[PDB]
A paper describes a structure:
We have further used this methodology to test a RAS-binding compound (herein referred to as 3344) that we have derived from an in vitro medicinal chemistry programme starting with an intracellular antibody fragment. Our major purpose in the development of the RAS BRET2 biosensors was to create a validation tool for compounds that bind to RAS and interfere with its PPI in living cells. We have identified compounds that bind to KRAS using in vitro screening and one compound 3344 (chemical structure and 1-D NMR characterization shown in Figure 1—figure supplement 3A–C) binds to KRASG12V with an affinity of 126 nM using 1H Carr-Purcell-Meiboom-Gill (CPMG) NMR (data are shown in Figure 1—figure supplement 3D). The mechanism of the interaction inhibition was corroborated by X-ray crystallography of KRASQ61H soaked with compound 3344. For X-ray diffraction experiments, KRASQ61H-GppNHp crystals were grown by vapour diffusion at 4°C by mixing 1.5 + 1.5 volumes of KRAS solution at a concentration of 75 mg/mL KRASQ61H, with 8–15% w/v Polyethylene Glycol 3350 and 0.2 M lithium citrate pH 5.5. Crystal Form I (KRASQ61H) has six KRAS molecules in the asymmetric unit, assembled as a hexamer. 3344 binds to a hydrophobic pocket near to the effector-binding switch regions of RAS. Whereas 3344 does not make direct contact with the switch regions, the BRET data show that the binding geometry and potency of 3344 is sufficient to interfere with the interaction of RAS-effector molecules that bind close to the 3344 site. The superimposition of the structures of three RAS-effector protein complexes with the structure of KRAS-3344 complex shows that parts of 3344 would overlap with the bound effector structures, suggesting that the competition effect of 3344 can be explained by straightforward steric hindrance. Therefore, the BRET-based RAS biosensors characterization of 3344 shows this compound as a pan-RAS-effector interactions inhibitor that binds KRAS, NRAS and HRAS.
A group of proteins known as the RAS family plays a critical role in controlling animal cell growth and division. RAS is a membrane-bound small GTPase switching between an inactive GDP-bound state and an active GTP-bound state. RAS signaling to the cell nucleus occurs after interaction of RAS-GTP with its effectors to trigger the activation of downstream signaling pathways. The KRAS, NRAS and HRAS family members are conserved proteins that have an almost identical amino-acid domain (G domain) from residues 1–166 but a C-terminal hypervariable domain.
Author numbering:
A (entry chain D): -3 to 61, 68 to 167
B (entry chain F): -3 to 61, 66 to 168
C (entry chain C): -3 to 60, 66 to 168
D (entry chain E): -3 to 62, 68 to 169
E (entry chain B), F (entry chain A): -3 to 168
Amino acid sequence: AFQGMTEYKLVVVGAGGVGKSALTIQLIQNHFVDEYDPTIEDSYRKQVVIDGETCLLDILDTAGHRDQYMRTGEGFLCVFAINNTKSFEDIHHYREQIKRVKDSEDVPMVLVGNKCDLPSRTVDTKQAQDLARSYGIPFIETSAKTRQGVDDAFYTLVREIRKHK
Amino acid sequence: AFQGMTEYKLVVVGAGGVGKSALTIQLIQNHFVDEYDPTIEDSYRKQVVIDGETCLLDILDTAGHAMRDQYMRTGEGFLCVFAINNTKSFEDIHHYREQIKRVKDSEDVPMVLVGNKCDLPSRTVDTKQAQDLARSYGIPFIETSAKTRQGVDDAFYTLVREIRKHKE
Amino acid sequence: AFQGMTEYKLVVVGAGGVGKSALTIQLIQNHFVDEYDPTIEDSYRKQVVIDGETCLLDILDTAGAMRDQYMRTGEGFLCVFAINNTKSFEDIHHYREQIKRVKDSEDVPMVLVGNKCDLPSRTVDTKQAQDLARSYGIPFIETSAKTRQGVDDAFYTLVREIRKHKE
Amino acid sequence: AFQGMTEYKLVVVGAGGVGKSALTIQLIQNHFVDEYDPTIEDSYRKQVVIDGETCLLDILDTAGHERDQYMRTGEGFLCVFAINNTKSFEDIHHYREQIKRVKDSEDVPMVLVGNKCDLPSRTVDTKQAQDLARSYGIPFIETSAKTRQGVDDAFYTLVREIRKHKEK
Amino acid sequence: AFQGMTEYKLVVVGAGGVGKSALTIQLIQNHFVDEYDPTIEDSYRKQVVIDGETCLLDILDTAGHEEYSAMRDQYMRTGEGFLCVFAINNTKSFEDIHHYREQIKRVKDSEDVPMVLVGNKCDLPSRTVDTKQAQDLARSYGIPFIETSAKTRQGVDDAFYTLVREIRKHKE
Amino acid sequence: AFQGMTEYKLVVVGAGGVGKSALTIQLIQNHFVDEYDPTIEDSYRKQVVIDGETCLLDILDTAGHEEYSAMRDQYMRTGEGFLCVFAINNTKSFEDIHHYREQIKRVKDSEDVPMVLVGNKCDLPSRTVDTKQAQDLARSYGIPFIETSAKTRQGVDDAFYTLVREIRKHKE
Ligand SMILES: Nc1nc2c(ncn2[C@@H]2O[C@H](COP(=O)(O)OP(=O)(O)NP(=O)(O)O)[C@@H](O)[C@H]2O)c(=O)[nH]1
Ligand SMILES: Nc1nc2c(ncn2[C@@H]2O[C@H](COP(=O)(O)OP(=O)(O)NP(=O)(O)O)[C@@H](O)[C@H]2O)c(=O)[nH]1
Ligand SMILES: Nc1nc2c(ncn2[C@@H]2O[C@H](COP(=O)(O)OP(=O)(O)NP(=O)(O)O)[C@@H](O)[C@H]2O)c(=O)[nH]1
Ligand SMILES: Nc1nc2c(ncn2[C@@H]2O[C@H](COP(=O)(O)OP(=O)(O)NP(=O)(O)O)[C@@H](O)[C@H]2O)c(=O)[nH]1
Ligand SMILES: Nc1nc2c(ncn2[C@@H]2O[C@H](COP(=O)(O)OP(=O)(O)NP(=O)(O)O)[C@@H](O)[C@H]2O)c(=O)[nH]1
Ligand SMILES: Nc1nc2c(ncn2[C@@H]2O[C@H](COP(=O)(O)OP(=O)(O)NP(=O)(O)O)[C@@H](O)[C@H]2O)c(=O)[nH]1
Ligand SMILES: COc1cc(-c2cccc3c2OCCO3)ccc1Nc1cccc(CN(C)C)c1
Ligand SMILES: COc1cc(-c2cccc3c2OCCO3)ccc1Nc1cccc(CN(C)C)c1
Ligand SMILES: COc1cc(-c2cccc3c2OCCO3)ccc1Nc1cccc(CN(C)C)c1
Ligand SMILES: COc1cc(-c2cccc3c2OCCO3)ccc1Nc1cccc(CN(C)C)c1
Ligand SMILES: [Mg+2]
Ligand SMILES: [Mg+2]
Ligand SMILES: [Mg+2]
Ligand SMILES: [Mg+2]
Ligand SMILES: [Mg+2]
Ligand SMILES: [Mg+2]
């Protein structure tokens, strides 16, 4: 018996202020949050259709500065801001922490370069694509403000989870 | 901030063979199950719109006969099911209602009375009797058939409305 | 890469006047057709969600070598009789045989449908129809195009049978 | 030019107690109302897809015994009788006449609805009702607000009749 | 008894040529109107789900400059919520916002009317109104501010959905 | 009797690398394709609601450069509407639009074919084709013009939905 639609547990990680909450809230509520209210832990849920399969996204929005939610997640959005080189260098640390806690090389993951609407770009697309090619994962540019790439990022993660299953 | 649609935990209880599973599967899959496969415990989930609110129904299908006390404490609302061709199942209703009230330590638990198999000609429980039982408990009564689908949506949607009323 | 929803080809067969068209029109338009207008061939399409998969049902409504054509094309068959017509129930065996010959296979996705279950003049017992279906290895469903009982179930069950046969 | 989905104003008329409200509430809420609470005037709204066109149904549920206002506003009328009440069937002629006078027209979109077709106490034969409907040039549908039989069909058929009357 | 989904009456106001119609048509039809066809009065309707509640938006698209003022006072009395739109490349339209807000407050005889400030045409390069200025104006009124572009669709849903949330808050 | 939703056959044409596949994939999967995988012929399908009518879009994604093919002329005769795509940073692709339009008119033997002009890659800073120029070209052909970006998703839905509206107009 089918017992209800497929459920995917997604976790959004990355440095303080890169736009993890803004991305998530733009997905769930179609709203851009302008304030910076630091997060402890928040949970969201949304039903969507991706490639003709109905599914339920459970989304965990994490704090910038834990082992529990890394063990629960099936897929991770690894977010940096394209105007903050430090947040991009930190990506390697988030990826390592996820791999240790799940004890696995092959974890579904997507690299997300957020704030692509800002004119102060310090991380080149080619650099981020290279980093992603080296990890074997997709890369997507987003803006929580304009909504560019937001759906794509979360839907691409879902496709990665499907492939890994 | 809204964090996702409202979730309702529904538990279907009643005697062996009244059609608890058949009702639930007819709601989830639009399928009538003809076989009688006795249930231990099964969990289902469905998104629906009731009175303009989108919600997620988590539905626990229970066995006819401490794991029991667990799900009674978790559930927010109960479908109490009997079969209209089985007078025993109708008399047992009062026992299920009492067990739920003891475990939740409450008089006012959201509940709906469901008289299933209303498509069968061998009726032994009168509608008026069942309506009286329900009036005495202060809860709605609905006749259903998992076979024809009559009243199935109504039963589960009415339960959700009862849960909403109890939360104001 | 996903390029659009999955499509399923369903064929409704059975004797004249059992309610093949009435069933189909009740599925597509939520309308009971009271008139009996005999069919040559009609095609319908509907999008639905079954078990969380969005799909497109292409439905061929048949008449009571153009016949061999649609048997080769269909992935699944609703075999319909009327519960008040014993002849239509005996004819089921003939439709099933013709389908198995044309597809050269024992295991073709199929559902047995006993229609007009709202009428009081029942001449085919449920148990008999269930036995026939158990012998063929296929599901049996009672329907009424008039009350709508079992209509969705019949078509959706057929789609599930097609899915099982494709794994 | 498109400003939002097409809107249809439907009016449900007929004698007291034939099930005008029960039909409407079964359409809107998937709920059978067992109590008889007489209506003054109630308004309902539902978005549906009929023949691939999205539309908004505005539905006016009327009182058995009261009017000219809502007959002028309506684009289509469900004329309801109960199949176990011969009087309600004879009254149909009066509702149809009143509608034709107020709209000053022979060709008003209309559907004849024989409700309570789940009851065994039938006093109006289907053939009689079909003849009445054939004489008026309108469809006839048997419904039960209890089992839900024919409910969607009645309202959707009325919408199709309104569409047909507008292409000229 | 529930009788059908909740209905919200939204009114889009602001100076001539700010993009009131373009915003509305982008919401209803997913179409950018490039032509500038001045509006008299137009009505639109759309069903949407916001925060899990299904609702029906009735949307009144108004004229920049009103011919006669009684027809203006009519729709201000009917509306439950107002999108107050200026164009970020037209400082005059931004200064006019204050006047639309005042007229609405007088006609509804209330300080706390559901309202959203909308800075439209944020895709254009000739920006003359700074974001910070508009945010300050909105903070002073106690209402949300959203940047939109009817062309790119940025912020369009957000503007209308945020207005509905403001109406809900005012009704509790 | 209604037998199922209306079906529209749409063909996407234009020079190599303008973003015909990227547009189509962004419509179907909400995904931006960054890689450039040249197309021979690909078929897509999507159900949408446009102006309250549910429809099924059958979409044929064509090759940039193809010598004469009879198999190519086949599907151009079957197609009911054409998206004519150029890239706003490639003046050659804009000049080629005239050639696609001529080929379509010859194969359909008709002046009045439903068609939409699409200027893609409007997110790039290397613009060489002005909006006004493209609007003038489109006004001369009697067809709509839409700026799109498969990357940002701007105008994507609008392009395909506008084509469907053009097909509807041509059928009345
Ligand atoms: N322009 C622009 N600003 C953005 C974008 N995403 C987030 N912001 C802004 O960046 C700031 C921080 O966003 P926030 O969502 O709180 O980031 P965070 O990763 O969740 N922070 P934390 O780890 O403390 O929870 C906010 O002021 C927000 O409005 C974007 O894509 N574009
Ligand atoms: N005619 C008819 N038969 C029904 C209906 N509902 C259930 N049945 C039949 O009655 C039997 C029991 O159904 P089932 O759901 O297994 O009962 P249950 O309450 O789940 N039993 P248990 O407690 O063992 O899990 C099955 O044979 C089923 O087909 C109905 O509404 N009408
Ligand atoms: N009472 C009742 N009548 C039905 C039912 N199904 C079909 N009918 C009636 O039976 C007649 C035959 O229905 P129809 O669908 O035309 O049968 P068919 O199998 O398509 N005939 P054919 O093979 O000629 O195309 C119609 O008058 C219809 O109203 C049902 O489930 N209940
Ligand atoms: N068995 C059966 N009972 C029905 C049906 N429809 C309505 N009833 C019952 O008949 C009674 C009257 O129903 P109601 O909807 O109030 O009729 P009404 O035409 O609206 N009355 P009024 O004109 O005063 O507003 C109620 O007790 C209702 O439960 C039906 O289709 N089947
Ligand atoms: N680039 C760009 N142009 C826009 C935007 N919004 C509107 N326009 C353009 O600005 C012009 C005015 O738009 P319109 O919606 O008619 O404005 P209005 O506020 O309704 N005018 P009126 O008050 O007379 O009815 C049109 O040419 C339109 O295309 C936008 O967000 N970006
Ligand atoms: N920046 C930007 N790049 C785009 C856009 N659309 C397409 N591209 C890029 O342009 C390249 C070509 O895209 P594609 O859709 O394959 O072009 P095509 O017209 O289908 N090519 P062909 O005719 O050979 O099949 C890709 O690398 C793609 O990422 C856009 O709107 N913006
Ligand atoms: C919070 O989770 C539930 C909670 C309930 C629920 C409802 C009511 C009472 C309960 C419940 O669960 C714990 C004990 O008490 C029911 C279902 C679920 N969940 C669910 C969703 C989809 C599929 C499945 C099937 N599993 C077994 C593979 C399950
Ligand atoms: C692949 O085509 C079909 C195939 C089938 C189909 C199903 C099963 C077997 C078949 C079939 O086709 C011919 C013979 O073999 C049924 C429907 C269709 N298609 C269809 C699509 C939209 C609208 C309509 C209605 N027409 C009359 C405009 C039809
Ligand atoms: C209740 O009526 C409305 C009310 C309002 C409305 C909203 C807000 C304020 C108002 C309003 O009406 C008049 C003055 O004040 C807006 C729309 C409508 N209705 C509407 C819906 C879809 C399409 C059309 C256009 N037709 C006639 C072609 C109309
Ligand atoms: C007849 O259907 C089409 C028609 C067209 C179409 C559109 C435009 C022009 C055409 C067309 O086809 C015939 C020649 O001219 C395009 C797509 C389709 N259909 C479609 C789309 C996606 C997937 C499938 C199943 N297979 C291919 C995996 C089918
Ligand atoms: Mg945060
Ligand atoms: Mg069970
Ligand atoms: Mg037929
Ligand atoms: Mg009433
Ligand atoms: Mg305007
Ligand atoms: Mg390509």
